[PDB]
Amino acid sequence: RSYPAIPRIYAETTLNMLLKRAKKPRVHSIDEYLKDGGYQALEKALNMSPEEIIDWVDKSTLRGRGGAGFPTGKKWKFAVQNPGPRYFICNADESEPGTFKDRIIIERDPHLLIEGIIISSYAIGANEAYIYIRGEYPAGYYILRDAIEEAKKKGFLGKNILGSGFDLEIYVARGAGAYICGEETALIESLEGKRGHPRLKPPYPVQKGLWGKPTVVNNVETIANVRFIISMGWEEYRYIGPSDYAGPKLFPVSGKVKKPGVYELPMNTTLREVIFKYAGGTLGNKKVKAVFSGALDCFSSEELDIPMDYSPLGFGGTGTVIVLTEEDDIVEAALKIAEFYEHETCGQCTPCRVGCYEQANLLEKIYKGEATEQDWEGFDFVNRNIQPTSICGLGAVAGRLIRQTLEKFPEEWEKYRK
Amino acid sequence: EFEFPEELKTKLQEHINYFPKKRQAILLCLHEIQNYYGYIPPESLKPLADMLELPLNHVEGVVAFYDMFDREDKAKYRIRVCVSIVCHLMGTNKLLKALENILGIKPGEVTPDGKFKIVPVQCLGACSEAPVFMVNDDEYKFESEVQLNEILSRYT
Numbered sequence: 001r002s003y004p005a006i007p008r009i010y011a012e013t014t015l016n017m018l019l020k021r022a023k024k025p026r027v028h029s030i031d032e033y034l035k036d037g038g039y040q041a042l043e044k045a046l047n048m049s050p051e052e053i054i055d056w057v058d059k060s061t062l063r064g065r066g067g068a069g070f071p072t073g074k075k076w077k078f079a080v081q082n083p084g085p086r087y088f089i090c091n092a093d094e095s096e097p098g099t100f101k102d103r104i105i106i107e108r109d110p111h112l113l114i115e116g117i118i119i120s121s122y123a124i125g126a127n128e129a130y131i132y133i134r135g136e137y138p139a140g141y142y143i144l145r146d147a148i149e150e151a152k153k154k155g156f157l158g159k160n161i162l163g164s165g166f167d168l169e170i171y172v173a174r175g176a177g178a179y180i181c182g183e184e185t186a187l188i189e190s191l192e193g194k195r196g197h198p199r200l201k202p203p204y205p206v207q208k209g210l211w212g213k214p215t216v217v218n219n220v221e222t223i224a225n226v227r228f229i230i231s232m233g234w235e236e237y238r239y240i241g242p243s244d245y246a247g248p249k250l251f252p253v254s255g256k257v258k259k260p261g262v263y264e265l266p267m268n269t270t271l272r273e274v275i276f277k278y279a280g281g282t283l284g285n286k287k288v289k290a291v292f293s294g295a296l297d298c299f300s301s302e303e304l305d306i307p308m309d310y311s312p313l314g315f316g317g318t319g320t321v322i323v324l325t326e327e328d329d330i331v332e333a334a335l336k337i338a339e340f341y342e343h344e345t346c347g348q349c350t351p352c353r354v355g356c357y358e359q360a361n362l363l364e365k366i367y368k369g370e371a372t373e374q375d376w377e378g379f380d381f382v383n384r385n386i387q388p389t390s391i392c393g394l395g396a397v398a399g400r401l402i403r404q405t406l407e408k409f410p411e412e413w414e415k416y417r418k
Numbered sequence: 419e420f421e422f423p424e425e426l427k428t429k430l431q432e433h434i435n436y437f438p439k440k441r442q443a444i445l446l447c448l449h450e451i452q453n454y455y456g457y458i459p460p461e462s463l464k465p466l467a468d469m470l471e472l473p474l475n476h477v478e479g480v481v482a483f484y485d486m487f488d489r490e491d492k493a494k495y496r497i498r499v500c501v502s503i504v505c506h507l508m509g510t511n512k513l514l515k516a517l518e519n520i521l522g523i524k525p526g527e528v529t530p531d532g533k534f535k536i537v538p539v540q541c542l543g544a545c546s547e548a549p550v551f552m553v554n555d556d557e558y559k560f561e562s563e564v565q566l567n568e569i570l571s572r573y574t
């Protein structure tokens with residue numbers, strides 16, 4: 001019925017798959033979804049063996065769209081190797097800076113996600129699945145709750161779905177402010193009603209996850225691909241983009257571009273094409289200084305000709321593209337990244353706890369011109385020493401982007417040392 | 419002594435009955451309470467703990483961990499303002515200055531009447547529409563002071 005206000009993010013697709021409907025900024029309910037063949041991939045999946053579904057998802061070469069790019073099929077195979085019961089979790093925590101790709105699927109085409117969740121749950125033998133959506137996506141929460149009910153009413157959820165003997169309930173959990181709850185093990189801890197504290201891995205969730213049982217965690221965008229793989233078949237899916245890195249990919253583009261929004265593009269597209277061919281170029285036609293890949297990586301204007309794929313020389317990550325131009329202060333920008341990690345460390349690991357804090361504190365001094373010589377040397381040290389003993393990816397990367405700015409824009413940093 | 423009103427207790431019971439295990443409802447319950455009171459009353463945690471079958475200590479630790487919850491200031495409307503990289507580049511400071519012009523308060527502060535609190539938050543996942551803000555559950559791009567003034571006038 002009535003939902004909270006959501007800004008209308010611009011969305012454009014060359015492939016017309018994930019954004020076939022979500023390119024229009026409004027909720028698409030179940031009847032609209034059904035008209036385009038919605039839920040027919042599910043019906044087809046329920047007439048396949050779980051094993052065959054895994055095979056197809058494997059041969060599609062689908063990789064995790066959450067940012068790490070782990071092969072989805074392999075992840076599923078690993079889970080099914082372990083005794084049940086098993087759980088399936090849709091990761092809708094999306095809290096990386098610059099990252100807003102998953103919410104347009106949630107808010108505009110929820111049945112694409114739900115259909116994927118049901119197929120995926122069936123494939124791994126899970127009778128209980130979860131969406132964990134960040135607390136700052138309230139509209140998404142209510143839109144998902146209503147869509148699940150719609151799906152129930154049409155017999156796509158519940159006991160004995162379409163006579164298949166497969167049972168599934170999808171529960172919707174909400175976050176309450178912690179970026180770390182998007183880390184899959186901390187998400188699980190949060191689902192168990194605890195603080196969002198990551199666990200030592202291995203074990204990976206597919207071995208021990210929710211209540212210690214085999215648990216697959218996949219990202220919203222990953223799961224949104226599953227309908228298509230079953231629908232078109234894996235061969236036809238792999239014909240999209242480069243054969244090595246196949247399928248559609250969503251690219252949330254922000255900062256100093258004429259046309260900020262989400263672009264659905266193949267992964268052979270270059271970073272330069274994302275910015276200039278699709279996003280309309282830079283505001284004021286100014287020169288690109290850097291692109292921040294969320295809070296993970298910083299690319300210079302000499303690295304724009306890279307593919308937006310999961311290859312070694314590729315952009316990788318979530319596909320998040322934050323554009324800075326020639327008048328943007330890289331130290332000011334780095335401070336904002338330091339501030340992020342300061343606010344999100346969970347504090348379990350000592351170098352992460354102290355390192356994230358000190359990196360921000362000292363960088364602020366540097367930026368404000370109040371840093372002693374010791375503060376400077378200390379900043380450098382701390383930046384290189386957040387990772388040690390860390391048990392999750394936050395600690396491992398919290399200095400990464402900033403270090404990249406130090407190496408790629410030394411002239412600008414040296415000015416701050418003056 | 420402290421007891422939930424029945425309309426609120428009923429809603430909390432729904433959340434508690436929703437997941438397979440009661441303790442899974444903790445965050446939904448805490449959102450509900452904050453929505454109802456304008457903040458998390460300290461005295462609410464003990465009875466919440468009992469409905470969840472969790473120790474009070476557990477509930478307190480959870481409230482302290484999750485940044486959306488506020489045990490200090492009652493506010494009818496929370497204006498969450500994004501202060502992360504993209505909004506900062508595209509004009510967080512203009513939004514904040516416009517807010518101070520209209521409401522006479524800065525981040526962390528509450529208007530004298532208890533109506534509006536400004537809450538600096540990390541990336542809200544709407545970066546293309548920077549600078550972004552929320553008023554409770556409603557989310558918007560900031561365009562100008564005049565535009566902001568009109569939006570805020572919708573919250574009485």
Ligand SMILES: NC(=O)C1=CN([C@@H]2O[C@H](COP(=O)(O)OP(=O)(O)OC[C@H]3O[C@@H](n4cnc5c(N)ncnc54)[C@H](O)[C@@H]3O)[C@@H](O)[C@H]2O)C=CC1
Binds near residue numbers: 096183204205217296
């Ligand atoms: N979308 C967003 O809002 C955010 C995304 N991220 C992304 O998070 C990424 C890091 O995530 P991680 O989970 O630490 O990465 P990872 O590389 O450790 O693991 C990726 C996935 O593969 C699974 N996996 C890996 N090796 C496995 C094995 N041997 N057996 C079974 N399963 C295995 C993991 O369980 C996980 O589900 C970063 O690249 C970043 O881009 C980070 C923050 C926010």
Ligand SMILES: Cc1cc2c(cc1C)N(C[C@H](O)[C@H](O)[C@H](O)COP(=O)(O)O)c1[nH]c(=O)[nH]c(=O)c1N2
Binds near residue numbers: 092183217
């Ligand atoms: C600190 C931090 C925060 C997040 C993550 C990692 C870390 C280190 N991950 C990645 C997550 O742990 C996991 O890799 C994916 O959810 C697995 O799904 P895919 O294989 O990408 O489909 C993650 N993934 C996601 O889907 N949404 C999110 O918001 C986050 N947040």
Ligand code: SF4
Binds near residue numbers: 390
């Ligand atoms: S590395 Fe940092 S965020 Fe990750 S578990 Fe350790 S303290 Fe928490």
Ligand code: FES
Binds near residue numbers: 097500503504506542
């Ligand atoms: S940086 Fe403000 S919404 Fe992302």
Ligand code: NA
Binds near residue numbers: 028
């Ligand atoms: Na349609």
Ligand code: NA
Binds near residue numbers: 093095177178179180
């Ligand atoms: Na969260």
Ligand code: NA
Binds near residue numbers: 201
């Ligand atoms: Na991992």
Ligand code: NA
Binds near residue numbers: 519563
């Ligand atoms: Na004014």
